[PDB]
C-alpha cells in the first residue's frame, strides 16, 4: 500500500499530474489581475497574490506526488531567495518546456537546445536596455510589491536617493517607534579571529591601541608560519602582530603554543579574509599602505614568518581602524574609491549581458566603497514586521538589479523580439527533423506574453510578432507601455528553468529506500 | 484523505456553496420575522436572533469549507469592531456582490467596482443627514437591537435625555434590582506601576501632600526620566512629582539606579500616556493643558540634560487633584465649552464627505472632557450579563455614531435613493458592455428592497422606483416609514462588503504548508 | 503478514516482475540519454542517474519481492565495491541472460554455456588495452571533462608522473591560489578503542610512542584470555603494553574492563586489526620487527600475557605511530614496501588478464605503499568549485581504475568483438538443439551495444562494420571513436550476471521462517 517501482506509466502520469496542478496555481495568478490563493496554515487561512509561498506550500499527500513536486518548487523559490521576484515566469515556462516529452536525447535536440538557448541568452543580453534610473523603479514597484506598502518604496528611494550601493543594512524592529535612516561612515569587510588569545579584546574584538604593527601576506604562506624568530622579535613586547591572509591558515593554529606557551609575550594575530574571489590583488590593496596600513603583498609564499622588512608601533594610519568579527576601517582616504571606480566602470562595461564571473570583483568592491546607511522600521506586530521585512527584501534586491544589473523592458518583449531573432537565426531543417520540430517549438517562447494578455483579452500573439509590441511594449488594449519586468530573474531564471524543463521530462521512475 | 488542490471544478462548487449556507444563516434572522437559529453550545442549545454569534459559530466539518468561510465570518465581526451592527447587511450584500463570479479582467468590471462604489461614497457624503435627535434614535431602536430588548436603550435614551454622552463608566453589578445612574466629580484616567517602587502610597494609593510641583516630559524620553536631580531636590522631603512619560523603555531601565539606589528619598510616580491619534491637534491638547497637569512641552530633540529652563511653584490651581489607582481631578476651568464648539465645527464642517478616518474623537476623546456617569445594571450571572453586555456595547456605539457622526434615515432609504443616484449617475450603456452589465448589477442594489419586502409581499421593484421610497419604503402593510438604520455601518461595512465580495469570488485554490 | 508458500508459477511471476522491472529501471539510465531515477529519502527526494544508488534502492514493499530483489542486487553492489562501476551492466545483462528462463531444462547446456562464457571471457582477456601511462589516458582525461580545467585534468597526471599509485583525496576551501599537493607518509589500517582508558589520548586518540612494548596476537583471539594481567603487572610502567588483537574480539572484554581497567592499570591496548588477509599479518610485521611491533606471531591466540616471549620495547625506529579511529603511521623508513610489494608488482604480471584471484588481493596488498595526496579544491564561485569538485571526484576514479584495472575499448567493442569471435565461433558448432538455441542467444551478447545505441539506433548483426566497429572503436554517432570503459566492469559484470542468470530460473519457490 505504498511507493515502490512505478514503471513508467504511473510515473509518467504522475509527472504529467503535478506539472499541471502546480502550473495552474501560478498560471491564473499572473500580473495585474492578480488572482488570490488561500494557503492554510496551522492557524487561520492566509490569502496571497504571488506564487512564492504558493510554491512553498504545494503539498499533496501521496508522497509520490509531493516528492515530485519537491523539485518543481525548489529552484523556482530558490531564484527568489536570490533575487526576490521572478518565480511566476520560471514555474510557467517550465511547463512550456515540459512540452519536450520526446526530445531528451543528449546529442541532437539538446545540443541544439543548449546552443539555441545560448543564442537566446545572447540576443537577450544584446536586447537588454539600461534600466538604471529610479523613476522606472517607480514603475517596477507597481507590481513587485503588488501596490501594498509604498512606504518601503519611499524608504528605498531615500536609500538610493543617497549615493549608489552603500552598506545596505539588515534590521527589523521588535520595538515600536523610530523609523530611522542614518548615513554613516563605515568600510566593513570580513576579517575575524583564529583563536580568542590572538585578540587584544574579548567583548567586541576592537584593537585597543592605534598605530599597530600589521604584517601583510595575502596568499598561501606555505612556510608553516610557526617560525616567528625575528619577525615577532621586532615587535616582541610592542604591539599585536596582525597577519591578514586568504584561507591558508594551516595546522600552525595548533602551533600557537610556540609563541603563547613558549617564548613570546606578543599578541600574534593571523586569520583569513573573505571567500574565493578574484581579489588576490585587491583584498590586500584595500588593507595596506594605499589606505595606510602596510605592504600590498602578492599571492605568494615568499617573505616567511622568520623575519620582516620593518615593523613599527607607528604602523597604522590616523583613521578608524578596529578589528572585529569583520574588520572595520572608517575614513578611507583614496584607494577604496580608486578600486571602486575601477570595478564601477567594470560593472558599467559588462552590465548589458550581465556575465558576473570575471566581474565579481564586485562581490565586495562596490559593496564596500560607498560607506553605510543603517535602516530601522516601525513594527507594531511581529507578523506585519516580518511582512514588511519580506517586502524590504523584495525591494532591496530589485534595487540591486536596477543598479548593478539593470531592468529589462516589457514582459514578453524579450521573448517576442527573440522570436524576431529566431527568424533572424537559422530557421531551416537542421541535422535532425526533431531539431526542426524543436525550432518550431522554440518558436513558442511567446507563450508568456500570450498567457499574460490572455488575462486581459485577447491572447493572439502571432500578429504581435511583427511590429505592434515594441519598444518597452507588450501591448494590451490599455496603454501599450509603462510595464517593465526586471532583468536577471528573467534571464538566469529562464536558463535554470530550461534545465527544469529538460530535467523533469527525463525523469522516469520513483523508488523508496532509506539511502 | 486530506488537503489537495481544488481547481476549478472542485472549487467553484465549494465556494459558490459557502456563501449560501452561510447566506441563509444570517439572511433569515433579519427584520420582524426573526426566524431563529439554534446555535449548539458545549452544553444545551442556545437559540439566537442576532447574527453576531450566528456568524461566529459558522462551522462546517471539512477543513476546506471551514477554511474558506473563515474570511466571510471575519468581516462580519469586523463590522462589530467598526460599530457593532450591520453584520447581516455585510453577509447579504457580499452575496449580492458575489455576482462577480467571472468578471476578473482589469479595466471595466473592476474599476466600476472601485469608482462606482467611490461615487456611492460620494452620495454617502451627500445623502447622510446627520441625525442627532433622539426621536430618530427612537426610530433606530425599533429594529437595531433585532427587536429584543429595550431596557438598556431606555437607559441610554435617559442618558441622552440628560447631559449627552458623558464618561459612561464601565462596571458590572451583582445585584438584581435598582439600576444606578450616578454622577460623580471625576475626570477619569488610570495609573499603575511598571516597577514596584513607582507607586506613592501602599495603603490606599492616595498621595499624602497636595500642591505638587508637577513637571512633565511628554515626548520620547530615552532616559526613562531620571533627570529629576534639581526639580526633585527642590521638593526633596515634601512630595513626589506626579510624572507622565512615554512607552519607550530602553536598556537604561537597569540604570534607573541613578535615582532608585542613589540619593533621593523621593516617592516617584511614572506611567505612560495613550497612543498616537490622527486628530493630533485635539488628542494631545486635551492631555496637556485641558487636564491642567503641568506644562505643554513641544515635540523636538533639542535642549539636552545639561540645563533646563525653569520650574515654577504656582503653575497649578486650587481644584480637585489627587493621585489614586485612577487619578481624580475635578473643576477644570475655562477652555472646555469653547473648545468643544470649535472642535465640533472642525469635525462637522468640511468633512461632510464623511470618511471614517478623520473624525476619531469618538474613540475616547470626550470621555476625558465630560466628567463621569457611573452605571450599575441587573447582573446576577456571568452569562446573561455578558449577553446584555454585548448588546450594551452594540447599542451604545451606534448611539455614539448618532451623537458624533449622525444617523441616516431608514433601511430601504439608503439603497432605493442610492439607486436614484444611479440615475443621477449614468444609467445608460457605459463605455463597455461589461460596464453596462456592472451598472445593471448595481441596479440590483434593490435586492435590499426585495429582501425587506419579501418577508411580507410583494417584491415588485420596477413600479415603486419613483415616488414611494421615503423613508425606508420597502413596502410592508404596516407604516411605510419611521425606522432608521445607522451610518458608519452602511459606509464601512459596505466598503468591506465590496472588498470581500471581491475577494472570495476569484479565490480558487486551497493549499497547505504547516508553519 | 502471510509470507507463505508461493507455488510455483507465482514464483515465476514473482521473479519475472522483479527481473523485468529491475531491468527497465536501469536499462534506460545507461548511455547518453540517461533518464533519471528519483530515489526517495525518508525526507525530500534525491535525483540520481547511476545504477549504484538505484540498485541500493530497488525496494518493493512486499516481503516476497524484497526477497527476490535481494539476489539480483547483491552482485550489483558487490561489483562496485570491487571496483566502482559495473553495476548497471551487471543487472542489465542479467535480464538479457534470463531469456535462458525458457530453457529451464539446462544441465545439458550449462556444462556447455558456463564453459563457453569462460572462453568468451578469455577472448575479452585477449582484447586488452593495458592503459597505465598517460598516452591514451590523456585522451581519457580529455574525454571525461571535455578538457574542463587543465589543473583538474593534468594535475592528477602530474601526481602519477612522480609518485606511484597514491591514495588520492580532495577537499574544499574558498580560496583562489594553487591546489595543495600533500605527499605525506601515512598508511591506512584499522584500530580504535575498546574503552577510552586504553588509549593514551582522547581527542585524536594519538599514541605517544616511546619504549613501546608490544605483545602480538595476529590471529583471531579465541583462547579467551582473562589472564592478560600478569605480564601487564610485570610490565606496568616499563612499557606501554600493546596487545594487538583481531576484529573478532570475544566477550572476554567484559572480563577485561573490570580487570585491567582496575588494579593493574598500565597503558594497555587490546583492540582490532584489519580483515583476514596477508596484510592482516603484514601491516603488523612491516612495522613489526622493522619498526617496533614485533616478530611474526602466527594466526592464533596462543601464549597470553602471563609473560611475553621477549620484552621488545626499545626498538623505536625511524617511524611514527599514531592510534586513531584507525591507527596509522607517519614517515616510516624501513623496507615495509620492499618486503612484499615487489612480489605484488610481479604479481601485477597477471594484469594482462587480471584474474579475480588478485583483483582483491593486489589492491589490498600493494596499494598501501607510500604518500597519499590530499588536496583542496578551488574556484572563484561556490558553484564552479562544486562543479570541478564533483568532476575531479569523477576523474580520480577512472584514473585509479586505469592504474589498477586497465582501460578497454568499451561500449560494445568488447562484446562485439566477442560476438564476432563467436560467429567464426568457439569451434564446436553446436549440434545440440539446446546448445544451438543457446549459441543463438549468446549471439545476444550483442544486446548491450544494441540497446545502448538503440536509445537512438541502430545495431544489427550485418551492421557490425558500419556502426559497431565503424569507425573501429567505441562509436557514438558524432565522431565514431574516442570512448573507453573500464575493463573489470565488462569482465566481472559478465561473470556474476551469469551467476544470476543461472539462479532466478533454477529458482522455484519461496518459503518463510526465522532460521
CSV table of N, CA and C in Angstrom, one decimal, chain C residues 68-130:
chain,number,residue,atom,x,y,z
C,68,UNK,N,13.3,-11.4,-3.4
C,68,UNK,CA,13.8,-11.7,-4.8
C,68,UNK,C,14.8,-10.7,-5.3
C,69,UNK,N,14.5,-9.4,-5.0
C,69,UNK,CA,15.4,-8.4,-5.3
C,69,UNK,C,16.6,-8.3,-4.4
C,70,UNK,N,16.7,-9.1,-3.4
C,70,UNK,CA,18.0,-9.2,-2.6
C,70,UNK,C,19.0,-10.1,-3.3
C,71,UNK,N,18.6,-10.8,-4.3
C,71,UNK,CA,19.7,-11.6,-5.0
C,71,UNK,C,20.0,-11.1,-6.4
C,72,UNK,N,19.3,-10.2,-6.9
C,72,UNK,CA,19.7,-9.6,-8.2
C,72,UNK,C,20.6,-8.4,-7.9
C,73,UNK,N,20.6,-7.8,-6.7
C,73,UNK,CA,21.3,-6.6,-6.4
C,73,UNK,C,22.5,-6.8,-5.5
C,74,UNK,N,22.7,-8.0,-4.9
C,74,UNK,CA,23.9,-8.3,-4.2
C,74,UNK,C,25.1,-8.3,-5.1
C,75,UNK,N,25.1,-8.9,-6.3
C,75,UNK,CA,26.1,-8.6,-7.2
C,75,UNK,C,26.2,-7.2,-7.7
C,76,UNK,N,25.1,-6.5,-7.7
C,76,UNK,CA,25.2,-5.1,-8.2
C,76,UNK,C,25.9,-4.1,-7.3
C,77,UNK,N,25.9,-4.4,-6.0
C,77,UNK,CA,26.7,-3.6,-5.1
C,77,UNK,C,28.0,-4.3,-4.8
C,78,UNK,N,28.2,-5.6,-4.9
C,78,UNK,CA,29.5,-6.2,-4.7
C,78,UNK,C,30.4,-5.9,-5.9
C,79,UNK,N,29.8,-5.6,-7.1
C,79,UNK,CA,30.6,-5.2,-8.3
C,79,UNK,C,31.3,-3.9,-8.1
C,80,UNK,N,30.6,-2.9,-7.7
C,80,UNK,CA,31.2,-1.6,-7.5
C,80,UNK,C,31.9,-1.4,-6.1
C,81,UNK,N,31.6,-2.3,-5.2
C,81,UNK,CA,32.5,-2.4,-4.1
C,81,UNK,C,33.9,-3.0,-4.5
C,82,UNK,N,33.9,-3.9,-5.5
C,82,UNK,CA,35.1,-4.4,-6.0
C,82,UNK,C,35.9,-3.3,-6.8
C,83,UNK,N,35.2,-2.6,-7.6
C,83,UNK,CA,35.9,-1.6,-8.4
C,83,UNK,C,35.3,-0.2,-8.3
C,84,UNK,N,34.0,0.0,-8.6
C,84,UNK,CA,33.5,1.3,-8.6
C,84,UNK,C,32.4,1.5,-9.7
C,85,UNK,N,32.4,0.6,-10.7
C,85,UNK,CA,31.4,0.6,-11.7
C,85,UNK,C,31.3,-0.7,-12.4
C,86,UNK,N,30.1,-1.1,-12.9
C,86,UNK,CA,29.9,-2.4,-13.5
C,86,UNK,C,28.5,-2.8,-13.0
C,87,UNK,N,27.9,-2.0,-12.2
C,87,UNK,CA,26.6,-2.4,-11.6
C,87,UNK,C,25.5,-2.4,-12.7
C,88,UNK,N,25.3,-1.4,-13.4
C,88,UNK,CA,24.2,-1.3,-14.4
C,88,UNK,C,24.4,-2.3,-15.5
C,89,UNK,N,25.7,-2.6,-15.8
C,89,UNK,CA,26.0,-3.6,-16.9
C,89,UNK,C,25.7,-5.0,-16.3
C,90,UNK,N,26.0,-5.2,-15.1
C,90,UNK,CA,25.6,-6.5,-14.4
C,90,UNK,C,24.1,-6.7,-14.5
C,91,UNK,N,23.3,-5.8,-14.0
C,91,UNK,CA,21.9,-6.1,-13.7
C,91,UNK,C,21.1,-5.7,-15.0
C,92,UNK,N,21.7,-5.2,-16.0
C,92,UNK,CA,21.2,-5.2,-17.3
C,92,UNK,C,21.3,-6.6,-18.0
C,93,UNK,N,22.6,-7.1,-18.0
C,93,UNK,CA,22.8,-8.3,-18.8
C,93,UNK,C,22.3,-9.5,-18.0
C,94,UNK,N,21.9,-9.3,-16.7
C,94,UNK,CA,21.2,-10.5,-16.1
C,94,UNK,C,19.8,-10.7,-16.7
C,95,UNK,N,19.1,-9.6,-17.2
C,95,UNK,CA,17.9,-9.9,-17.8
C,95,UNK,C,18.1,-10.4,-19.2
C,96,UNK,N,19.2,-9.9,-19.9
C,96,UNK,CA,19.4,-10.5,-21.2
C,96,UNK,C,20.1,-11.8,-21.2
C,97,UNK,N,20.5,-12.3,-20.0
C,97,UNK,CA,20.8,-13.7,-19.8
C,97,UNK,C,19.7,-14.5,-19.3
C,98,UNK,N,18.6,-13.9,-18.8
C,98,UNK,CA,17.4,-14.5,-18.3
C,98,UNK,C,16.3,-14.6,-19.3
C,99,UNK,N,16.7,-14.7,-20.6
C,99,UNK,CA,15.9,-15.4,-21.5
C,99,UNK,C,16.3,-16.9,-21.6
C,100,UNK,N,17.2,-17.3,-20.7
C,100,UNK,CA,17.5,-18.7,-20.5
C,100,UNK,C,16.5,-19.3,-19.7
C,101,UNK,N,15.7,-18.5,-19.0
C,101,UNK,CA,14.4,-18.8,-18.4
C,101,UNK,C,13.5,-19.8,-19.1
C,102,UNK,N,13.3,-19.7,-20.4
C,102,UNK,CA,12.6,-20.6,-21.1
C,102,UNK,C,13.3,-22.0,-21.2
C,103,UNK,N,14.6,-22.0,-21.2
C,103,UNK,CA,15.4,-23.2,-21.2
C,103,UNK,C,15.8,-23.7,-19.8
C,104,UNK,N,14.7,-23.9,-19.0
C,104,UNK,CA,14.9,-24.3,-17.6
C,104,UNK,C,15.6,-25.6,-17.5
C,105,UNK,N,15.2,-26.6,-18.4
C,105,UNK,CA,16.0,-27.8,-18.6
C,105,UNK,C,17.4,-27.4,-19.2
C,106,UNK,N,18.4,-27.5,-18.3
C,106,UNK,CA,19.6,-26.7,-18.5
C,106,UNK,C,20.9,-27.5,-18.4
C,107,UNK,N,20.9,-28.6,-17.8
C,107,UNK,CA,22.1,-29.3,-17.4
C,107,UNK,C,22.9,-29.8,-18.6
C,108,UNK,N,22.2,-30.0,-19.8
C,108,UNK,CA,23.0,-30.3,-21.0
C,108,UNK,C,23.7,-29.1,-21.5
C,109,UNK,N,23.1,-27.9,-21.5
C,109,UNK,CA,23.6,-26.7,-22.0
C,109,UNK,C,23.9,-25.7,-20.8
C,110,UNK,N,24.4,-26.3,-19.7
C,110,UNK,CA,25.0,-25.5,-18.7
C,110,UNK,C,26.5,-25.8,-18.5
C,111,UNK,N,26.8,-27.1,-18.6
C,111,UNK,CA,28.2,-27.5,-18.8
C,111,UNK,C,28.7,-26.9,-20.1
C,112,UNK,N,27.9,-26.7,-21.1
C,112,UNK,CA,28.2,-26.1,-22.3
C,112,UNK,C,28.4,-24.6,-22.2
C,113,UNK,N,27.3,-23.9,-21.6
C,113,UNK,CA,27.2,-22.5,-21.6
C,113,UNK,C,28.3,-21.8,-20.6
C,114,UNK,N,28.5,-22.5,-19.4
C,114,UNK,CA,29.4,-21.9,-18.5
C,114,UNK,C,30.8,-22.1,-18.9
C,115,UNK,N,31.2,-23.1,-19.6
C,115,UNK,CA,32.5,-23.2,-20.2
C,115,UNK,C,32.6,-22.3,-21.4
C,116,UNK,N,31.6,-22.0,-22.1
C,116,UNK,CA,31.6,-21.1,-23.3
C,116,UNK,C,31.8,-19.7,-22.8
C,117,UNK,N,31.2,-19.3,-21.7
C,117,UNK,CA,31.4,-18.0,-21.2
C,117,UNK,C,32.8,-17.8,-20.6
C,118,UNK,N,33.4,-18.9,-20.1
C,118,UNK,CA,34.8,-18.9,-19.8
C,118,UNK,C,35.7,-18.6,-21.0
C,119,UNK,N,35.4,-19.1,-22.1
C,119,UNK,CA,36.1,-18.9,-23.3
C,119,UNK,C,35.8,-17.5,-23.9
C,120,UNK,N,34.6,-17.0,-23.7
C,120,UNK,CA,34.3,-15.6,-24.1
C,120,UNK,C,35.1,-14.6,-23.2
C,121,UNK,N,35.1,-14.9,-21.9
C,121,UNK,CA,35.9,-14.0,-21.0
C,121,UNK,C,37.4,-14.1,-21.3
C,122,UNK,N,37.9,-15.3,-21.8
C,122,UNK,CA,39.2,-15.5,-22.3
C,122,UNK,C,39.5,-14.6,-23.5
C,123,UNK,N,38.5,-14.5,-24.4
C,123,UNK,CA,38.6,-13.6,-25.6
C,123,UNK,C,38.6,-12.1,-25.2
C,124,UNK,N,37.8,-11.8,-24.1
C,124,UNK,CA,37.8,-10.4,-23.6
C,124,UNK,C,39.2,-10.1,-23.0
C,125,UNK,N,39.8,-11.1,-22.3
C,125,UNK,CA,41.1,-11.1,-21.8
C,125,UNK,C,42.1,-11.4,-22.9
C,126,UNK,N,41.7,-11.5,-24.2
C,126,UNK,CA,42.6,-11.3,-25.3
C,126,UNK,C,42.5,-9.8,-25.8
C,127,UNK,N,41.3,-9.3,-25.8
C,127,UNK,CA,41.0,-7.9,-26.2
C,127,UNK,C,41.3,-6.9,-25.0
C,128,UNK,N,42.6,-6.6,-24.9
C,128,UNK,CA,43.1,-5.8,-23.8
C,128,UNK,C,43.7,-4.5,-24.3
C,129,UNK,N,43.6,-3.5,-23.5
C,129,UNK,CA,44.5,-2.3,-23.7
C,129,UNK,C,45.0,-1.9,-22.3
C,130,UNK,N,46.1,-2.4,-21.9
C,130,UNK,CA,46.6,-2.1,-20.5
C,130,UNK,C,47.1,-0.6,-20.4
